[PDB]
């Protein structure tokens, strides 16, 4: 898929690797109700390393994007 | 998609409803990378609501439709 090469840079910031993603995700074919599963697993296996782990410290309530990115900043 | 009003039906078992989901999403014109994720939320979504609870304290760890299946089957026993 479109958003599939899309990786956090190592000298991005989480944000800006976020806006690019969810702007790949939205302008796919893939159907709406596919788009915040499909962002937070790219969260998950496409970020920095350090924050790859911070999100597998994260409680499995946080089920949407924001909560997400509003995580990582927080720490 | 598909699979949009696949629910876990009150006399069915979470092993046959996820059968039937996992079938939806794969012969679906998903890309193979979202079907897991698709399928994990759906898990989430439209199981018994007993089940969604049981979901909802899982590890963010099991991330295979496989392993969120084990953990039900193992949390019931």
Same mark, same amino acid.
């Given at each position: 898929?479109?958003?599939?090469? @899309?990786? +956090?840079?190592?000298?991005?910031? &989480? !944000?800006? &690797? #976020?806006?690019?993603? /969810?702007?790949? !995700?939205?302008?796919?074919? %893939?159907?709406?109700? #596919? =788009? #915040?599963?499909? /962002?937070?697993?790219? &969260? =998950?296996?496409?970020? +920095?390393?350090? /924050?790859? +782990?911070?999100? =597998?410290? #994260?409680?499995?309530? %946080?089920?949407?994007?924001?909560? @997400? /990115?509003?995580? !990582? %900043?927080?720490?």
């Amino acid at each position: 898929g479109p958003w599939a090469d @899309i990786m +956090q840079g190592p000298s991005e910031s &989480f !944000v800006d &690797f #976020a806006n690019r993603l /969810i702007k790949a !995700v939205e302008g796919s074919d %893939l159907p709406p109700s #596919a =788009r #915040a599963p499909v /962002i937070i697993d790219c &969260f =998950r296996q496409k970020s +920095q390393p350090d /924050i790859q +782990q911070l999100i =597998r410290t #994260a409680p499995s309530t %946080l089920t949407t994007p924001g909560e @997400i /990115i509003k995580y !990582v %900043l927080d720490r």
